Amino acid sequence: HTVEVMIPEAEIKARIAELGRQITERYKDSGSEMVLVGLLRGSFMFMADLCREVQVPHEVDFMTASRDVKILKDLDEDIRGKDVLIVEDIIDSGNTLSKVREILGLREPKSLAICTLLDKPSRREVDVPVEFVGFSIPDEFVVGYGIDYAQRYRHLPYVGKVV
Numbered sequence: 001h002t003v004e005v006m007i008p009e010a011e012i013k014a015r016i017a018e019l020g021r022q023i024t025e026r027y028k029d030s031g032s033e034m035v036l037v038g039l040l041r042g043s044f045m046f047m048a049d050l051c052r053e054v055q056v057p058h059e060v061d062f063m064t065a066s067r068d069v070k071i072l073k074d075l076d077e078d079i080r081g082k083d084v085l086i087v088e089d090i091i092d093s094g095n096t097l098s099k100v101r102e103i104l105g106l107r108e109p110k111s112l113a114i115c116t117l118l119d120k121p122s123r124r125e126v127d128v129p130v131e132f133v134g135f136s137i138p139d140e141f142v143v144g145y146g147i148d149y150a151q152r153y154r155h156l157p158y159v160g161k162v163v
């Protein structure tokens with residue numbers, strides 16, 4: 001197989017700056033504390049780029065999930081009464097994401113939303129709400145920007161297609 005560029009690095013960058021202005025507008029006037037929560041390992045790169053574009057004061061935290069959805073590593077921060085934005089790299093089935101959303105919901109955050117870089121709507125098995133989407137894509141075999149295919153390509157600066 002081989003990997004071709006699907007969404008170039010510069011397009012991801014321009015799109016993230018828009019998501020950032022958009023998230024900033026949506027939360028700018030809340031005043032409450034804000035927390036961006038990534039799901040490891042996939043979201044680390046998107047989180048790094050996204051949080052630098054969110055001009056609202058906030059903390060960044062991570063959690064690891066994965067039959068029942070279990071927490072392999074919980075949040076270090078408390079979110080009760082805070083605005084929380086879950087940061088995903090890609091959503092397809094939406095199963096894990098919906099369970100994570102429920103788990104976090106029990107902590108009574110002021111608000112809870114999801115921002116994913118890539119969305120694959122045609123694969124949704126459960127229907128979870130998603131407030132911000134970077135790119136909506138067909139059901140393509142994608143890698144890069146945090147997404148791996150058998151432990152590699154995770155470090156590519158662009159989203160590529162495995163051929």
Ligand SMILES: [Mg+2]
Pocket residue numbers: 039042043088089090
């Ligand atoms: Mg993920």
